[PDB]
Amino acid sequence: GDAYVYRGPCQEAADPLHAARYAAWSVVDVHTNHTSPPRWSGVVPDGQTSAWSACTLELPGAFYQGAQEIDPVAAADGTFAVNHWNTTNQKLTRLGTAYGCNQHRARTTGAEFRVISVTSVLWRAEISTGWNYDRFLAKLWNGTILAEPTTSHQDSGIPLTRGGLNWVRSENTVYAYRNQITAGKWYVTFWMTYDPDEWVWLDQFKLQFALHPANWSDPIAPRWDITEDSLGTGLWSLQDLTFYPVGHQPAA
């Protein structure tokens, strides 16, 4: 069917503080990416273990179409397993069931364009379990909204407000942090990739997942015009997180 919107806080998927979060993020391997494309442990869709995500948020709120509260299970069409992939023991473990999704590809301004690919999956956990992500030297990025002058010329018009990447940090970082889920709770997992080379698909639902590339162009300079169809995807904010029944999401 049609899209529905999430209302409520987005929380870290971790027991102590369940603290709110205000951005989706993406973990970048800058340790072993030269050897071969980075393929690590994490949350993965169905049997496509190459599409690993380290960004999962708990959703304790509710979902609406217009003024009406809706149940993502009732609105669902397709479903598939949301799994944990462990590269150390090569074990794929079912975490829950996907009921909604969204996907988007954002292209930069101007010639020689760059793509951000984003896929979001709304799923309900059916086990209570925890895991740590893998250890490797990393960067981290999220999409930000940037006000900037209109031209290189000194004299600006009304400032542009466009997307850019916050890409951190110069110091060394490892993101081997803990996630914990509770059976029955609702989560969103974000697969976000800057400048990917390859995608994998859940062909039955025409649902894309970009893979982490071995190499990528400068992430600092590019700018993305913010389009109406990028709203709700998680890319530029967590505002108005929007999901579609699986198989009914927009094409990429």
Between residues 96 and 196, which has the closer beta carbon with respect to K ion? Answer: 196
**Which residues have CB under 8 Å from 79's CB, separation 6+?**
97, 98, 99, 246
Between residues 39 and 185, which has the closer beta carbon with respect to K ion? Answer: 39
155 phi/psi in degrees, rounded to 5: -85, 115
Looking only at the bridges linking them, the beta strands covering 11-12 and 242-245 are unpaired
Structural contact between residues 78 and 131, judged by C-beta atoms closer than 8 angstroms:
no
The residue from 8, 213, 219, 247 that contacts K ion (CB under 5 A) is: 213
Q: Does 110 bind its own copies (CB under 8 A)?
A: no
Q: Is 86 exposed, middle or buried (0-12, 13-18, 19+ CB in 10 A)?
A: middle
Among K ion, its own copies, none, partner that 52 touches (CB below 5 to 8 angstroms by kind): none
The residue from 1, 2, 20, 218 that contacts its own copies (CB under 8 A) is: 20
Among K ion, its own copies, none, partner that 239 touches (CB below 5 to 8 angstroms by kind): its own copies
DSSP letter string over 63-119?
EEETTEEE-HHHH--B-EEEEEEETTTTEEEEEEEEEEEEEEEEE-SSSS--EEEEE
Between residues 114 and 162, which has the closer beta carbon with respect to its own copies? Answer: 162
Reduce the DSSP state of residue 26 to 3 states and report it.
Answer: strand
State how far the Cα of 185 lies from the Cα of 82, in Å rounded to an integer.
Answer: 13
Closest approach of K ion to the CB of residue 198, in Å: 9
Chain residue whose CB lies nearest K ion: 213
Within residues 129-168, the interface with its own copies by CB under 8 A covers 140-142, 144-149, 152, 154-159, 161, 166, 168
Binding mask 176-195 for K ion (x = CB under 5 A): -------------------x
In the complex, the residues that contact its own copies under the rule CB under 8 A are 12-14, 20-23, 25, 67, 140-142, 144-149, 152, 154-159, 161, 166, 168-169, 171-179, 226, 228, 236-237, 239-240
